[PDB]
């Protein structure tokens, strides 16, 4: 599975790609 | 946060599935 530096957006869709129609958090520091 | 595991570092999917319903 992909996990090589995913950041931002790009993050946000592995998350999507794993967890699917089920929904998921994300968080980012400011 | 997951950005400080799987974006300053290499991740898994399971710890992907940390972060699902």
Same mark, same amino acid.
């Given at each position: 599975?992909?996990?090589?530096?995913?950041?931002?957006?790009?993050?946000? %869709?592995?998350? +999507?790609?794993?967890?699917?129609?089920?929904?998921?958090? +994300? &968080?980012?520091? &400011? | 946060? *997951?950005? %400080?595991?799987?974006? &300053?570092? *290499?991740?898994?999917?399971?710890?992907?599935?940390? +972060?699902?319903?």
């Amino acid at each position: 599975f992909v996990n090589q530096h995913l950041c931002g957006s790009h993050l946000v %869709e592995a998350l +999507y790609l794993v967890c699917g129609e089920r929904g998921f958090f +994300y &968080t980012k520091p &400011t | 946060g *997951i950005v %400080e595991q799987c974006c &300053t570092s *290499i991740c898994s999917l399971y710890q992907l599935e940390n +972060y699902c319903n």
